[PDB]
Amino acid sequence: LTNLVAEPFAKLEQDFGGSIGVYAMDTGSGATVSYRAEERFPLCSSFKGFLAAAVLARSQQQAGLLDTPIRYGKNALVPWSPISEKYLTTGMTVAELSAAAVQYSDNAAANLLLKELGGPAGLTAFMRSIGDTTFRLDRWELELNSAIPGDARDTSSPRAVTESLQKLTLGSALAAPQRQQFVDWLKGNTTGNHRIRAAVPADWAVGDKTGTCGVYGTANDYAVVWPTGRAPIVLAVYTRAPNKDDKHSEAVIAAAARLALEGLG
Ligand SMILES: *[B]([O])([O])[C]([C]N1[C]=C(C([O])=O)N=N1)[N]C(=O)[C]C1=[C][C]=[C]S1
């Protein structure tokens, strides 16, 4: 059954006018569904989930990190920073910046956290530390969104995203409290209701992080899903398309997720 999804994905790609990348893993079986699971796709804002996890990992060695106040100025602001804008007058703690980045995809917040962490190379090193050899972050918000076809900057594979997400949310890469905080942040995400969440029965708990580059039909979602009374499922859906003005589609990400889940039957 896991090998009967190729033609359904191909049709979806053809309808979409671009490329879809999927990796889904049932943590009960170990069983997987792949489709372009090894190809690079741009992360767009989906790197912010892993950023927050990296912050949490630092907090295991550094008490008082998460509650540290960051009083940023208006200069820290860039587009797509709805929470950072709203809290300009008060500042935000590292934890509040992390939640804004994950749950609202806040750009300014993500860049502030990158700066704490040693930049794109520092995040990349953290992902190496958990055994992810594919992930690379090269640039900052907003230029990491360029999504130029063939460009490996600021990309990973669906497989590596899912494997890394599993380690951090369900595996041993984070301490217990930190692990739960990561899961909670992903669970309260607000930007993903039309993506993997739309593909999942209403009764199942879901945590996710989205990404939207805004060019080259490039957008994505990754998630942990808790089917009632069963082992979690972890999955990643990434898209791109050949022309700069090709439109991304949330509906295609949801349909891709439904196929992957079906494939795990
Ligand atoms: B992220 O994907 O790197 C970032 C912030 N963002 C936009 C969205 C969305 O459009 O739903 N989610 N998160 N992307 C950008 O800042 C580039 C843009 C995407 C759309 C307009 S600008």
Q: Tell me the resolution in Å.
A: 1.9
CA dihedral in degrees (28, 30, 33, 35; nearest 10)? 140
Strand partners, 83: none
Expressed in angstroms and rounded, the spacing between residue 160 Cα and the centre of ligand 1 is 22
Active-site annotation holds for 143: yes
| AA identity, residue 135 | F
Distances from the Cα of 87 to the Cα of 42, 102, 140, angstroms: 29, 16, 21
- H or E segment and range at residue 254: helix 250-263
Exposure string over 197-234, b if 16+ CB within 10 A, otherwise e: bbbbeeeeebbbbbbbbbbbbbbbbbbbbbbeeeebbb
232: Cα within 13 Å, side-chain hemisphere: 17
Confirm or reject: Cβ of 91 under 6 Å from ligand 1: no
Q: Hey, whose CA ends up nearest to atom 20 of ligand 1?
A: 214
Structure determination method: X-ray
Atom of ligand 1 nearest to the CA of 144: 3
Token digits of residue 11: 């049709």
Phi, psi of 143 (to 5 degrees): -70, -20
Expressed in angstroms and rounded, the spacing between residue 105 Cα and the centre of ligand 1 is 8
**Of residues 159, 175, 181, 184, the one with CA closest to residue 234:** 159
Q: What is the count of structural domains for the chain?
A: 1
Give the integer Cα–Cα distance in Å for 191 and 50: 16
Q: What is the DSSP string of 199-242?
A: GS-TTSEEEEEEEE-SSTT-EEEEEEEE-TTS--EEEEEEEE-S
Catalytic residue among 29, 85, 129, 143: 143
Contact by Cβ (8 Å): 33, 257: no
Expressed in angstroms and rounded, the spacing between residue 135 Cα and the centre of ligand 1 is 19
Give the integer Cα–Cα distance in Å for 126 and 113: 14
Catalytic residue among 19, 45, 98, 157: 45
Contact by Cβ (8 Å): 8, 257: no
Atom of ligand 1 nearest to the CA of 214: 19
3-class SS letters over 120-184? HHHHHHHHHHCCCCCCECCCCCCHHHCCCCCCCCCEECHHHHHHHHHHHHCCCCCCHHHHHHHHH
Contact by Cβ (8 Å): 5, 235: no
| AA identity, residue 65 | L
Best residue among 44, 141, 246 to mutate for probing ligand 1's pocket (most ligand atoms within 8 Å of CB) is 44
Q: Name the DSSP class of 249.
A: -
Supply the range of the domain harboring residue 103.
1-265
Q: Hey, whose CA ends up nearest to atom 11 of ligand 1?
A: 212
**Of residues 237, 42, 53, the one with CA closest to residue 139:** 42
Give the integer Cα–Cα distance in Å for 241 and 222: 19
Binding site membership for a beta-lactam: which residues?
45, 48, 80, 105, 107, 210, 212
| Contacts of 68 by beta carbon, 8 Å cutoff, 6+ apart | 93, 94
Contact by Cβ (8 Å): 264, 23: no
Expressed in angstroms and rounded, the spacing between residue 55 Cα and the centre of ligand 1 is 21
Token digits of residue 3: 């090998």
Give the integer Cα–Cα distance in Å for 230 and 205: 11
Is the torsion defined by CA of 83, 88, 89, 91 positive or negative? positive
Three-point CA angle 129, 133, 139, nearest 5°: 90
Give the integer Cα–Cα distance in Å for 194 and 45: 16
Contact by Cβ (8 Å): 22, 37: yes
Active-site annotation holds for 45: yes
The CB density around residue 67, as the number of other CB atoms within 10 Å, is 11
Best residue among 113, 145, 210, 250 to mutate for probing ligand 1's pocket (most ligand atoms within 8 Å of CB) is 145
Number of DSSP helices (H) and strands (E) in the chain, helices first: 9, 9
CATH number at residue 175: 3.40.710.10
Token digits of residue 198: 């739309």
Expressed in angstroms and rounded, the spacing between residue 229 Cα and the centre of ligand 1 is 35
156: Cα within 13 Å, side-chain hemisphere: 32
**Of residues 158, 128, 157, the one with CA closest to residue 236:** 158
